[PDB]
Amino acid sequence: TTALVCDNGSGLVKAGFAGDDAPRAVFPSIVGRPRHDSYVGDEAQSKRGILTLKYPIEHGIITNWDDMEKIWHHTFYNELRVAPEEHPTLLTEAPLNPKANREKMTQIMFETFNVPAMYVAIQAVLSLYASGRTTGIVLDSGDGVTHNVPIYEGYALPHAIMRLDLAGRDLTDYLMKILTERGYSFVTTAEREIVRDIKEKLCYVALDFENEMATAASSSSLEKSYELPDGQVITIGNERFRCPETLFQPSFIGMESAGIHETTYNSIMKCDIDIRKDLYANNVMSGGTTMYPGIADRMQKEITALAPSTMKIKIIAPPERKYSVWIGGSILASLSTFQQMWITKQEYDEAGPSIVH
Amino acid sequence: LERGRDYEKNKVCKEFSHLGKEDFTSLSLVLYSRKFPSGTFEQVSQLVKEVVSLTEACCAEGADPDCYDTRTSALSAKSCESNSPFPVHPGTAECCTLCMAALKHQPQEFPTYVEPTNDEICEAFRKDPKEYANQFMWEYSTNYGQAPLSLLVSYTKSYLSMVGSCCTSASPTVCFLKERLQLKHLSLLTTLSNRVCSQYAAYGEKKSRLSNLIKLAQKVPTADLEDVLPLAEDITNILSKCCESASEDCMAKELPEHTVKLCDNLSTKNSKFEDCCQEKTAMDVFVCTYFMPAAQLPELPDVELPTNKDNTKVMDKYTFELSRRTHLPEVFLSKVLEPTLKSLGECCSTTCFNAKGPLLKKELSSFIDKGQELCADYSENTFTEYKKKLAERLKAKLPEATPTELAKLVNKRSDFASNCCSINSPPLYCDSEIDAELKNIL
Ligand SMILES: Nc1ncnc2c1ncn2[C@@H]1O[C@H](COP(=O)(O)OP(=O)(O)OP(=O)(O)O)[C@@H](O)[C@H]1O
Ligand SMILES: [Mg+2]
């Protein structure tokens, strides 16, 4: 159980110990270097004006290994303060992470960090595990990518996984844009931080979009005041729900792709007719970008308008879904029956990195 | 040697004594539920109540030697009352004048059972444990009745042992993850055996064989007949043997062993199969290979429909070759290849294959083209994208159709495709819809 659990996210890394109920360390996935030695996380972000920030994980997939190693080293020694060679380590990966990518993670872990053992789990599958279920369809929306992953008794159907290259940062960028069209001005790194805060506190998904627009144009019953750090007080109106509406309508940011209600529906339709009922009735939502109030209700409505009239639709969106993935790892890594699922250093020293599968 | 005149009696009494009244009642609830898939919860609970009564009485020490055979007949008598409180097999009436001992019930291709959330499960278990357990054994067994009885009893038993154990745990959610993972093996074995057995029951051994060869050919198009034919034949044999066998080991043993052969022979022929075979246990592999979609077909020159003089290896070869190069779902191929080989066969003498050959070749060619149109675009696009293109298709072919009408045809066609254009589409249902769809083909 004394294993480590590290959820390598596009925007945030969630690290802790198997068994805890929440990540002990949550820092931005960033590696910066002096503009003209090496910093990670918050600090590297703070000293931005004199460094070169780099994101090792763009859309869920680790793209730059040298930087990733820095994140892992920082995760172990600075954030958790432990010896990686003394703790089995469980790492997470995106839904369709390439085999070669996984093997490279496994190699670095054993050879560079000397972990006694490790495991790589599909993020979405852990979110499902967190709710104590092994079958259902997960909608995972984080910082840089959104996925729909159908799962049957622990098996993720690769051919039914749906993706949408739109998540949290795009929503933040988009809220900045429409807030600026309203008269305010949000364009700098700093103002971005203010908009992300506005996004996470005042935004919500409208059950019925067009009607909500009408209500915002008809009255001020939807307005909300927000105090800037300097005291200025602005009002957020229809941008409260217009921002999140982008998830169901990617066209708001010029993306001609299906919204999350359709990605969920498409994903289910890729599965055999006899198991779709168990996807519809176990639609789990996870990730920071599924935190919007009213999103579960909006999804339940959309899917109901798409599924057969006799189909039971149930959305599972817990209050702590922001860390569902990490939590599913903490639980799975603590199970006594999972201890034989680890990959030992002895085993690794056999078929090399091509052992993690 | 023939089973004793009282093979049944001695069997039930032996079970009633080894399990006690409670567990024998459960065994019976499961048994009569799978036997009567359409039976309401009360018709089956009522019958089960009668069965357990007779059994207790007729198995009692000093019981009249005619008792069991007398009561069971008074049980069948009640099953003919019209206003009977017991279930009834299709046309059980055309027998009420002993066919009511072993009548057939078709497989369930669209199970409705939906496991409730953990919260709902525990909410109903608290209210009434016995009730919950009974309602569950009924609905599950009526929905997955084609799985062997021993598998159903074993699964429903372990599942209930999980609910009682996790709903009273300090960490329900944590317990459910642990218990559900340990239950995975049996759960997979149970639900998957029901599905493969329902297909087998619908097809019959001959069609089933053909069906499994077609499906294996579509999953591994770049394989050799010798690589798959033995496998397709292996599963068919396991199906005819284990689907209806009291041997509480047949399926449980055979199925995992089939998966090992599947991997030994196919592991190194496809990226997808390699992935499937890397799974931890047999059932994890079987679920992967079972769900594996028809692959992108190689696309080679047309294949010739054998019509010479000719064991049975030429038609197998042809099936294999045709399916591996024809983008048409297995339910279509199985549907047309059956009455196509029935014609070629009833031909053999040589003059025959000369007047029918061209006849069968054309209809088959026409059939294949019809299906490709009914299933066009379905496999290559997400469903919502398929519906768009479909509307684009039907529009430019029905200029006078009103937007409303157009959308009605779109819905009907896409509805058909979502049910009959994938690798594991339901045989019974699709065989009837395919006929209907072809007539409306346009
Ligand atoms: N309450 C909230 N309302 C809206 N957005 C939120 C909320 N809390 C967090 N977010 C957004 O969630 C994102 C971070 O979520 P998360 O940690 O799930 O992503 P990630 O795992 O790092 O990314 P990925 O899964 O794509 O690799 C940010 O854009 C953040 O603003
Ligand atoms: Mg994430």
Side-chain angles (χ1 to χ4, degrees), chain A residues 9-12 14 142-145 168 196 199-200 287-288 291-292 322:
Chain A
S10 296
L12 292 161
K14 278 71 69 163
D143 199 50
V145 69
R196 183 189 67 70
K199 183 190 79 179
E200 305 186 357
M291 289 297 295
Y292 291 93
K322 179 190 284 191

Side-chain angles (χ1 to χ4, degrees), chain B residues 2 12 22 31 76 163 229 239 319 330 435 441:
Chain B
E2 54 188 295
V12 299
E22 194 179 2
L31 191 167
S76 51
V163 176
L229 186 60
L239 291 172
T319 300
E330 175 279 347
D435 291 330
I441 195 61

Side-chain angles (χ1 to χ4, degrees), chain A residues 99 129-133 152-153 155 157 159 265-266 269-270 272-274 276-277 281 314 331 337 357, chain B residues 110-111 113 115-116 118 120 144 173 180 184 187-188 191 195 271 278 288 293 381-384 418 424 426:
Chain A
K99 285 165 282 184
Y129 282 6
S131 59
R133 305 285 280 200
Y152 195 65
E153 301 272 336
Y155 178 63
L157 288 307
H159 54 282
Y265 183 51
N266 284 170
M269 293 306 272
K270 282 299 186 176
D272 287 7
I273 66 179
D274 62 307
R276 302 183 192 164
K277 65 189 170 60
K314 306 178 186 170
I331 297 182
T337 51
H357 283 303
Chain B
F110 303 103
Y113 172 81
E115 174 182 32
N118 289 173
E120 299 175 311
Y144 300 85
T173 300
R180 286 175 178 296
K184 179 175 160 81
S187 182
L188 247 24
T191 301
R195 185 51 58 216
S271 181
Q278 282 170 46
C288 184
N381 306 283
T382 57
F383 197 69
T384 54
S418 71
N424 292 318

Side-chain angles (χ1 to χ4, degrees), chain B residues 152-163 179 183 186:
Chain B
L152 288 169
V153 168
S154 176
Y155 169 72
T156 60
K157 189 172 183 303
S158 304
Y159 178 81
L160 291 171
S161 167
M162 167 178 73
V163 176
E179 290 287 69
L183 181 64
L186 180 48

Side-chain angles (χ1 to χ4, degrees), chain A residues 7 9-10 14 123 140 142-143 287 325:
Chain A
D7 179 18
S10 296
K14 278 71 69 163
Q123 288 155 8
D140 207 283
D143 199 50
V325 171

